[PDB]
């Protein structure tokens, strides 16, 4: 019933961890590579957190109202402007 | 009505000096002068228009003239200026000493003349204010506003010492001292306006209305201490004096003329008008200590003065010695003691002014302050030896000069109220003999010299002569026919006197 | 059951541990670690309080606390990297140039 | 009359003129104005004295203005010419004028001629103020002015250290005296609030219903001052060294001016001292002791000037005895005669110490009799009047009238003493005289005659004789009480005086005029040597004073050359500088530190919050 | 509780700022032009100010449970905007020297400023936490903005770590108090409970760190020196002014704000910051470090007027007056220092020596620097005084003797060092600008001193105007 | 639902102590993760579901992650091991240990004062935490974005290292 969600959770985390670690291993092999790699990984964590927020918004949408939605809007728009920033800063050129 | 222009003319004066220097490297002096002639003239005009002798005792709040204008209404603080016989005299004195301080530096250049003279005007004017001011805020404000400019004058135009203290350090000692004493007098004033309002629900920083204030015995005390301390540092009273010898040692000549001849005066005058009226009872209880510190200043002053190797410093300690006598004179109800105080303050004003101006030309001619390398100096110069002699005579209370007039009235009164102390102080007079003499010998009598510097020296320019002679004449007349002074001051004196006593 | 005192005691114990570590550690990595342990302990406390009282506030705050956590790990590690090109070990005492 | 002012305005004008003319004037012109003014002041003294006698001896008061006004305190600039005043004044402008001529010649070609004469004019002006004293304050202008001018003339030859320090011993001491006088003034004003002789004399018996306790002090201080300016004990120490001045000065200040000022003040306040018996008694006493010690010491001086000095001290002593025993007319009479023959003595001493090429020491002098007639003769006349030779000397009449008061009031101890003192004086006076004019002529002197030297010496010689005794001071119209007269004992007394005087002169003749082998033998003796140095040294007073005052005073001055108070105050500044550095020691860039710091501080905040 | 058009008008400056933030960050991402990005940011702030005016036309409402928008908020916002704006007009030339990208700067500035407005407008507890995170994060970067020097970097790291430790205490404190007392709003401080106090004291720890109050002051000189001079300007004025705004308002509503234990720990803290401040300030040669210790003390002085809040309402007023004074004075000094660093070159004008004569070739900066140099020390003719004044007034009037004495003693010590400095500026010169970007900073300092002089001499205008912006009670 | 709390807690505690003691970073980060999970469990104990879950997927899910990533890319962890062991000794550890122990004691003492009023572990739907998150706290949601974004801008301006190697 419950413990299965907790298993998919500890699992999800476990996997993000191992994966991130291996990506660290492969990363170990005008900015420079390591800088770009970091910036990217970081924006990943950010997207993660802000996503948390988004879901929170999702669970209750009609109860939030036109202001709730307008909020979600400015929120996501800014997140996106943040991505435009990261890209246009050149952490994309290599990974 | 006219008080404003009395503070302005010096202010605007300074500004003009500064913005005229660039027209000719000689002009600033002339500006300072002219403006000082104007100011003095005005002082003499308010002197003439108001009654030479005015009603003796109509009550504490009385003035030949008054001027009121809003300033910080939020606080009931306004521009309040008020003339008395007392203040009138202090203002004439300051105007004169002004003209002279402009003369005595007529032959001293460093940095910029514009900046020098301006600084000077801000000092002089600001203090004039310290006299005319009756609204406690404005008073305190003028009180600090002058200290700044003075400290620029010392730290920017004064010569380095023999003891290895940079002029900047003298300026420092002076400033910290007077300024923070200032802090204490401020917090007193604060406590007082607070009490008056907290018993009549009205914020006012006004002298008159603050008198009314009812006060728990013990609080009036503490307040009056604040005011004292701040007057004790600028007088000076003992412990709080060292800034004086140092600051005189390092000061430019105009700075020592104005410092010795006025600011200390303001210290006493504030003692009178504020420490007594505002707090008659606490004062009355504090008179003993006040008078004893007065005797200790008489003596300790004369001793340090006499054991002096440097001229300017001995002179300074002389002023300390005499202030001792004034501080005593004040806390002794006598109105005689107060007439004595007044005439003697203005007297010693003229006197010390004379000594520091001369000592100035003496330095100008043998580039030294250490008597240790000067002697039999009489043979060399023309007038300096003998005018220096006259002023040395007058310093120690010699009849024929004001200093006697005032110091002896003071003594008479003091004696009527407390003899033991008066006699002791008179012995102080005997010490005055010693130091004034020692100084005189060391300078002009004995071995032709103790250093090559003594050969036939240059003459005394007409400036120097006629200013030192003007001063002499003044001191002679004051010794001879004091009535005009005694009268001009008798009104205000009688008033403070009556009030101090009655209120106990 | 749920004695508020015990939950809060946990929060405290942890906070303290994290701080201790933060002082003991010379290696900037370890210090950052400390900081994380701390912000975490404080958010924990906040949620525990949000549990004593039937309020969503303990939680939404916790949310903010971890938002912070993230931002600080971002900038803090970014600094560490900027300092790996300047010190093999990230021995922190080495940055003592400015003094009284 | 009514020109009482000119007797000050003249000396004063002269003074200002000579003081504003520094060396720019030929000795003859500055001499002209210097002597001249005072001359015209003498002239005016004559005119006014004559209008005074003619007018019938009426007290003349000329008010000039009011020197100052306060409530109960009114002091005025008024001149009060009466008989006593006329004596003082006449003496001053006369003897003054004479000393002015003799000085005129004596100072030819010397450092600051114009200067010396200016100072002198101021000395006269000052004295004349002193004597026309309406109150005590204007008088105090007198006393101070005097003391000052005396400081300047004594310390006239500034180049030498010893000279100056003599001028300063003078000023300091005369000053301390002037302080006692002050106290007198303060008390007399707190009590009578008038400080004007007559009035004080009236409101004095009135207000002092239960007096004899505050009046005492007032008078006794008046004394303090008197003693001070008259060099009586114990403010005498300043007189000997005073001789460091040019001779004409040692005449002026030493015979007709300062000491006389002390006695005269004690005279004008006669009524006040009267009301206080004991202190008048004191006056007498100190007068006595002083004439005695002064004599004994005068006996040993190896210096012309200094002998004459302790002489003036002993003589003033006499005068103070005369006053101390209500013999006021006697005291003042004697003051006059003494101005005469002391002026004589000192001028002569100048002509001699000069004619010996500045020698000034009796022993390095000798046999002057043949070399100089005028001078020798002068020392004989003078020295004799001073010795109080029975006839041909006014000094005899002086001493006499005095002892006539003394004995005439049952004060036979002061009388006997005073006699012992006449013996003394004749003795030392002639030891000196003989030693200087008789015996082996060591320094070959020669003589020079001029009007400006001879004339003065001549008039002083005349008036120094019995012819001087011809003049009598109008001390009756003033009201000073007449002395209790005596008779039949007046002659026993008189001849006792004459006899002691003559025995004196003779014994001096036998003591020195020969080999002096007796005196010499008795000098080398142990006791004779001890005493010798004793009396030579002002009795040891200069020692007692320099040891209990000067030494410890200078002791303090050295002990505080730097303000222990200024330092005591620099304490906080220091505490705050070192506090500065101390604390500042916690900014050490150690991040770890700062953190541990937050930790601890938190801990303190929590502990405090818990305890409160 | 939602949001109406009213509440938007009343969130106006905040909006305008946010907008400028995003806009500028985007423009940066597209073109990378210095001049443009700057002029943009300034257009934006100015906007937010006049916006203030339009807030003035509207009511003193409450936008969420997290805010309140009154005249008090209007005052603190106005200030923080001035601070920021100035900071920018200063950092321009200094950056113009800088070799790297100059743009990210003005962004970090905008962000911090926004956070400062959250502080001047907060009423909830979270709002505060977030306001301090916004006032901290971009500042870390601003400290490290020239990381090339060992200083700037060591600085940025120290400031960052410690700053995080503090944010951490502050958090865990909020946790403890809300835990004991089930509300986040200020007014409901859990209506002298142990845990309540405790939490409040950790909160102290944090606020105190941000405020430079002893014993949480240490980082101050390191960080004032290490960072680019303008970033110091903003580091003393904006951040501190605003965090103080929030601490005043908090300790006001907060009923536990009338507590004794806390008033005591507080007073202690204040006293000690005054003293240690000026004492450590004396023996300094490094202008910056001086200004830093100096700040520790001045935070002492305001802390006074905060301790005397309970007794009298002029208290706050004083605080406002003195906060404006402090403002223009610190902008003057720091203004002439970063302006002295001028184009980037290498390290800044840390050494006082550099200042000497300096009036002989660069007169007006020396004037400005002396007028401010007096102001800061408490001399008449300067707002610094007037503020001194009020602090003392509120001091005795509230009967806080120790604290007052300390105030005067301090003032003395300061007399010493500040006086020295100005004189330095007049001593003799040691032996050895074209762009209208320098003139901005120039007329900026100029104006600012002209304010401490005029407003020094005729305070009414400011006083009443501050008296006018009360909080809702 | 009760004991689970306690065991989760002590387990976590032990885990953090361990992270603080150990020298090899990976072991540390791992341990801190274990701790965080135990605290996710504790969170669950109090029916803070959105909390505990959020901790699993976000805190130890992406943060602790970015950490591991950086320690692994830098690969710094490993070498300096003995150099790290030198630092942790009794002499250096005891001071701070005592201090923080004290502080802990004062805090805890101040904890045992407030009234516990033990409250049941009654679940809190995420949807609720969101109903509040996006109603009362609207502005906060909007600003946490700003906090993270600034986090970025600075993280870039610092964490980025130009090409200083190439020489002109
Ligand atoms: O012109 C001569 C000299 O004058 C000065 O020297 C000397 C000068 O000679 C000398 O008179 C002067 O006075 C030293 C006075 C000590 C006693 C004071 C009074 C003590 C009394 C105790 C009972 C209470 C009343 C007071 O000092 C100068 C050297 O410190 C000059 O320095 C020399 O160059 C000159 O040659
Ligand atoms: C310049 C002199 C300053 C003196 C300051 C101290 C005065 C203390 C008075 C104490 C009185 C106690 C009476 C009981
Ligand atoms: C520096 C900014 C100052 C803003 C003051 C605002 C005062 C608003 C008063 C509103 C009263 C309704
Ligand atoms: C010389 C140093 C003097 C320091 C005086 C401090 C006075 C403090 C008064 C506090 C009154 C409350």
Swiss-Prot record, chain C:
It is found in: Cell inner membrane. It catalyses: a quinone + NADH + 5 H(+)(in) = a quinol + NAD(+) + 4 H(+)(out). It comes from the Bacteria. Keywords: Cell inner membrane, Cell membrane, Membrane, NAD, Quinone, Translocase, Transmembrane, Transmembrane helix, Transport, Ubiquinone. Its main location: membrane. InterPro entries: NADH_UbQ_OxRdtase_chain4L/K (IPR001133), NUOK/Mnh_C1-like (IPR039428). It is an enzyme of class 7 (translocase). Its EC number is 7.1.1.-. GO terms for molecular function: NADH:ubiquinone reductase (non-electrogenic) activity; quinone binding. The keyword Translocase applies. The chain crosses the membrane at residues 4-24, 28-48, 60-80. NDH-1 shuttles electrons from NADH, via FMN and iron-sulfur (Fe-S) centers, to quinones in the respiratory chain. The immediate electron acceptor for the enzyme in this species is believed to be ubiquinone. Couples the redox reaction to proton translocation (for every two electrons transferred, four hydrogen ions are translocated across the cytoplasmic membrane), and thus conserves the redox energy in a proton gradient. Belongs to the complex I subunit 4L family. NDH-1 is composed of 13 different subunits. Subunits NuoA, H, J, K, L, M, N constitute the membrane sector of the complex. This is NADH-quinone oxidoreductase subunit K. It comes from Escherichia coli (strain B / BL21-DE3).
């Amino acid at each position: 019933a419950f413990a299965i969600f907790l298993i998919v959770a500890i699992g999800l985390c476990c996997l993000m961890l191992v994966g991130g670690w291996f990506l660290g291993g492969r990363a170990r092999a005008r900015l420079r590579l390591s800088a770009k790699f970091y910036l990217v990984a970081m924006f990943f964590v950010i997207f993660d957190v802000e996503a948390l927020y988004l879901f929170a918004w999702s669970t209750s949408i009609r109860e939030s109202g036109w202001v709730g939605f307008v909020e979600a809007a400015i929120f996501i728009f800014v997140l996106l402007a943040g991505l435009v920033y990261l890209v246009r800063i050149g952490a994309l050129d290599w990974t | 009505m006219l008080l404003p222009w009395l503070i302005l003319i010096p202010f605007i004066g300074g500004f003009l000096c500064w913005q005229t220097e660039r027209f000719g490297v000689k002009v600033p002096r002339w500006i300072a002068l002219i403006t000082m002639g104007l100011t003095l003239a005005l002082s003499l005009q308010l002197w003439l228009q108001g009654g030479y002798s005015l009603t003796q005792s109509a009550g504490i709040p009385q003035w030949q003239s008054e001027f009121d204008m809003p300033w910080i209404p939020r606080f009931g603080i306004s521009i309040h200026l008020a003339i008395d016989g007392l203040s009138l005299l202090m203002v004439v004195l300051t105007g004169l000493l002004g003209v002279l301080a402009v003369l005595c530096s007529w032959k001293e250049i460093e940095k910029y003349q514009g900046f020098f003279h301006l600084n000077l005007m801000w000092i002089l004017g600001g203090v004039i204010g310290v006299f005319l001011a009756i609204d406690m805020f404005l008073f305190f404000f003028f009180w600090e506003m002058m200290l700044v400019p003075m400290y620029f004058l010392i730290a920017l135009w004064g010569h380095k010492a023999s003891d290895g203290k940079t002029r900047i350090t003298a300026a420092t000692k002076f400033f910290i001292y007077t300024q923070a004493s200032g802090l204490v007098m401020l917090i007193a004033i604060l406590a007082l306006v607070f009490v008056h309002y907290n018993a009549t629900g009205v914020w006012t920083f006004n002298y008159e209305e603050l008198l009314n204030t009812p006060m728990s015995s013990g609080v009036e005390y503490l307040l009056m201490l604040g005011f004292f301390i701040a007057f004790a540092v600028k007088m000076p009273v003992v412990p709080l004096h060292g800034w004086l010898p140092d600051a005189h040692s390092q000061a430019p000549t105009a700075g020592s003329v104005d410092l010795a001849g006025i600011l200390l005066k303001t210290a006493a005058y504030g003692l009178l008008r504020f420490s007594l009226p505002l707090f008659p009872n606490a004062s009355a209880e504090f008179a003993p200590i006040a008078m004893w510190l007065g005797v200790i200043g008489i003596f300790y002053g004369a001793w340090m003065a006499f054991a002096q190797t440097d001229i300017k410093r001995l002179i300074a300690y002389t002023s300390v010695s005499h202030m001792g006598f004034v501080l005593i004179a004040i806390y002794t109800g006598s109105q005689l003691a107060y007439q004595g105080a007044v005439i003697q303050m203005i007297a010693h004003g003229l006197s010390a002014a004379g000594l520091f101006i001369l000592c100035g030309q003496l330095y100008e001619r043998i580039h030294t302050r250490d008597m240790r390398m000067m002697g039999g100096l009489w043979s060399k110069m023309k007038w300096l030896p003998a005018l220096s002699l006259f002023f040395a005579v007058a310093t120690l209370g010699m009849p024929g000069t004001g200093n006697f007039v005032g110091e002896f009235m003071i003594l008479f009164g003091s004696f009527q109220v407390v003899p033991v102390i008066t006699v002791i102080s008179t012995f102080g007079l005997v010490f005055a003999s010693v130091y004034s003499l020692a100084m005189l010998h060391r300078a002009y009598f004995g071995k032709a010299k103790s250093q090559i510097a003594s050969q036939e020296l240059p003459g005394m320019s007409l400036r120097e002569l006629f200013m030192i002679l003007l001063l002499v004449v003044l001191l002679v007349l004051l010794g001879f026919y004091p009535q005009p002074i005694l009268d001009t001051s008798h009104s205000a004196i009688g008033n403070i006197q009556q009030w101090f006593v009655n209120s106990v | 059951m749920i004695p508020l005192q015990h939950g809060l005691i946990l929060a405290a114990i942890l906070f303290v541990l994290g701080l201790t570590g933060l002082v003991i550690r010379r290696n900037l990595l370890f210090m950052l670690i400390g900081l994380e342990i701390m912000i975490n302990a404080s958010a924990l406390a906040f949620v525990v309080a949000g549990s004593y009282w039937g309020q969503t506030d303990g939680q939404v705050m916790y949310i903010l606390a971890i938002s912070l956590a993230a931002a600080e790990a971002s900038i803090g590690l970014a600094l560490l990297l900027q300092l790996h090109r300047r010190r093999q070990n990230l021995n922190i005492d080495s940055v003592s140039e400015m003094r009284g | 009359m009514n020109m009482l002012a000119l007797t000050i305005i003249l000396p004063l004008i002269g003074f200002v003129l000579l003081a504003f003319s520094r060396g720019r004037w030929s000795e003859n012109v500055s001499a002209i104005v210097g002597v001249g003014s005072v001359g015209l002041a003498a002239l005016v003294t004559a005119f006014i004295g004559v209008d005074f006698f003619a007018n019938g001896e009426q007290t003349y008061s000329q008010p000039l203005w009011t020197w100052m006004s306060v409530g109960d305190f009114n002091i005025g600039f008024n001149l009060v010419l009466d008989g006593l005043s006329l004596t003082m004044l006449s003496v001053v402008t006369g003897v003054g004028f004479l000393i002015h001529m003799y000085a005129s010649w004596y100072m030819r070609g010397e450092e600051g001629y114009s200067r010396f004469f200016a100072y002198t004019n101021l000395f006269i002006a000052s004295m004349v103020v002193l004597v026309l004293a309406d109150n005590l304050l204007l008088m105090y202008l007198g006393w101070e002015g005097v003391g000052l001018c005396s400081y300047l003339l004594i310390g006239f030859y500034y180049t030498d250290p010893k000279n100056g320090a003599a001028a300063m011993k003078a000023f300091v001491v005369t000053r301390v005296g002037d302080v006692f006088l002050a106290f007198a003034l303060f008390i007399l004003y707190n009590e009578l609030g008038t400080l004007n002789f007559r009035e004080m004399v009236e409101l004095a018996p009135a207000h002092f219903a239960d007096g004899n306790n505050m009046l005492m002090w007032a008078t006794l201080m008046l004394l303090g001052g008197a003693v001070g300016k008259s060099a009586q004990l114990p403010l005498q120490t300043w007189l000997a060294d005073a001789m460091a001045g040019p001779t004409p000065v040692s005449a002026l200040i030493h015979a007709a001016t300062m000491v006389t000022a002390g006695v005269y003040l004690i005279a004008r306040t006669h009524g006040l001292f009267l009301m206080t018996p004991e202190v008048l008694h004191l006056v007498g006493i100190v007068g006595a002791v002083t004439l005695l010690l002064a004599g004994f010491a005068a006996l040993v001086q190896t210096d012309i000037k200094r002998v004459l000095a302790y002489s003036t001290m002993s003589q003033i002593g006499y005068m103070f005895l005369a006053l101390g025993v209500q013999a006021w007319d006697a005291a003042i009479f004697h003051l006059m005669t003494h101005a005469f023959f002391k002026a004589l003595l000192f001028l002569a001493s100048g002509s001699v110490i000069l004619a010996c090429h500045h020698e000034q020491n009796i022993f390095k002098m000798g046999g002057l009799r043949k070399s100089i007639p005028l001078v020798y003769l002068c020392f004989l006349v003078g020295g004799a009047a001073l010795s109080a030779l029975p006839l041909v000397t006014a000094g005899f009449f002086s001493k006499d009238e005095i002892l006539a008061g003394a004995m005439a009031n049952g004060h036979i101890n002061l009388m006997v003493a005073g006699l012992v003192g006449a013996f003394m004086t004749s003795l030392y006076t002639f030891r000196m005289i003989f030693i200087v004019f008789h015996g082996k002529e060591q320094i070959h002197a020669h003589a020079v005659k001029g009007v400006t030297h001879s004339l003065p010496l001549i008039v002083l010689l005349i008036l120094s004789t019995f012819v001087g005794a011809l003049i009598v001071p109008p001390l009756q119209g003033v009201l000073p009480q007449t002395t209790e007269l005596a008779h039949g004992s007046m002659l026993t007394l008189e001849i006792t005086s004459g006899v002691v005087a003559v025995v004196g002169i003779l014994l001096a003749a036998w003591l020195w005029l020969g080999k002096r082998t007796l005196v010499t033998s008795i000098a080398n003796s142990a006791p004779g040597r001890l005493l010798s140095t004793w009396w030579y040294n002002a009795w040891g007073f200069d020692w007692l004073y320099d040891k209990v005052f000067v030494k410890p005073f200078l002791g303090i001055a050295w002990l505080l050359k730097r303000d222990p108070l200024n330092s005591m105050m620099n304490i906080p500044a220091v505490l705050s500088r070192f506090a500065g550095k101390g604390l500042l020691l916690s900014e050490n860039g150690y991040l770890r530190w700062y953190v541990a710091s937050m930790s601890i501080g938190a801990v303190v905040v929590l502990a405090l919050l818990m305890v409160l | 509780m939602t949001i109406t058009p009213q509440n938007l008008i009343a969130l106006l400056p905040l909006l305008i700022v946010g907008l400028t933030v995003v806009v500028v960050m985007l423009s940066i991402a597209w073109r990378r032009n210095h001049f443009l990005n700057a002029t943009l940011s300034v257009i934006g702030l100015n906007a937010a100010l006049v916006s203030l005016w339009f807030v003035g036309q509207a009511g003193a409402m409450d936008v969420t449970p997290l805010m309140r928008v009154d005249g008090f908020a209007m005052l603190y916002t106005g200030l923080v905007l001035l601070a920021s704006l100035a900071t920018c007009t200063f950092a321009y030339p200094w950056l113009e020297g800088y070799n790297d990208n100059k743009d990210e700067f003005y962004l970090l500035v905008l962000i911090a400023a926004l956070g400062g407005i959250l502080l001047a407008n907060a009423n909830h507890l979270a709002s505060l936490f977030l306001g301090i995170e916004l006032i901290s994060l971009p500042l870390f970067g601003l400290v490290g903005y020239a990381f090339r020097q060992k200083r700037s970097l060591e600085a940025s790291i120290k400031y960052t770590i410690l700053s995080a430790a503090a944010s951490s205490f502050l958090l865990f404190g909020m946790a403890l108090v809300y835990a004991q007392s089930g509300d986040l709003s200020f007014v409901a401080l859990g209506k002298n409970e142990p845990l309540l106090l405790a939490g409040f004291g950790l909160m102290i720890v944090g606020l105190g760190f941000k405020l430079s109050l002893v014993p949480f002051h240490l980082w101050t000189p390191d960080v004032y020196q290490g960072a680019p001079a303008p970033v110091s300007t903003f580091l003393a004025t904006a951040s501190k002014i605003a965090i103080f705004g929030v601490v005043m308002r908090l300790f006001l509503y907060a009923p536990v704000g009338d507590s004794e234990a806390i008033r005591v720990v507080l007073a202690i803290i204040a006293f000690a910051s005054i003293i240690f401040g000026n004492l450590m300030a004396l023996s300094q040669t490094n202008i910056k470090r001086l200004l830093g210790y100096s700040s520790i003390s001045h935070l002492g002085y305001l802390l006074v007027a905060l301790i005397a809040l309970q007794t009298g309402e002029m208290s706050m007023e004083a605080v406002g007056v003195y906060l404006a004074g402090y403002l223009f004075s610190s902008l003057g000094a720091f203004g002439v220092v970063s302006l002295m660093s001028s184009p980037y070159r290498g390290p800044d004008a840390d050494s006082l020596f550099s200042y000497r004569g300096l009036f002989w070739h660069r007169p007006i900066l020396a004037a400005v620097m002396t007028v401010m140099m007096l102001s800061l020390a408490g001399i008449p003719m300067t707002l610094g005084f007037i503020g001194k004044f009020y602090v003392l007034a509120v001091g005795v009037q509230a009967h806080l003797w120790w604290l007052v004495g300390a105030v005067v003693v301090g003032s003395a010590i300061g007399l010493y060092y500040y006086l020295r400095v100005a004189v330095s500026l007049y001593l003799h010169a040691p032996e050895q600008p074209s762009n209208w970007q320098y003139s901005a900073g120039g007329i900026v300092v100029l104006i600012s001193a002209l304010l401490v002089l005029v407003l020094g001499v005729w305070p009414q205008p400011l006083i009443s105007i501050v008296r006018l912006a009360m909080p809702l009670m | 639902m009760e004991f689970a709390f306690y065991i989760c807690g002590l387990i976590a505690i032990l885990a953090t102590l361990r992270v603080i003691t150990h020298t090899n970073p990976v072991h540390a980060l791992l341990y801190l993760i274990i701790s965080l999970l135990a605290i996710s469990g504790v969170f669950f104990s109090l029916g803070a579901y959105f909390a505990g879950a959020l901790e699993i997927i976000v805190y130890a899910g992406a943060i602790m992650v970015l950490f591991v990533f950086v320690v692994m890319m830098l690969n710094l962890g490993g070498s300096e091991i003995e150099q790290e062991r030198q630092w942790l000794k009794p002499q250096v550890w005891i001071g701070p240990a005592i201090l923080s122990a004290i502080m802990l004691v004062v805090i805890v003492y101040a904890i045992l004062g407030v009234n516990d009023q033990g409250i049941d572990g009654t679940p809190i739907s995420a949807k609720a935490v969101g109903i509040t998150l996006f109603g009362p706290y609207v502005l906060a949601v909007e600003l946490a974005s700003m906090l993270l974004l600034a986090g970025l801008v600075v993280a870039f301006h610092v964490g980025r290292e130009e090409r200083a190697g190439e020489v002109l």
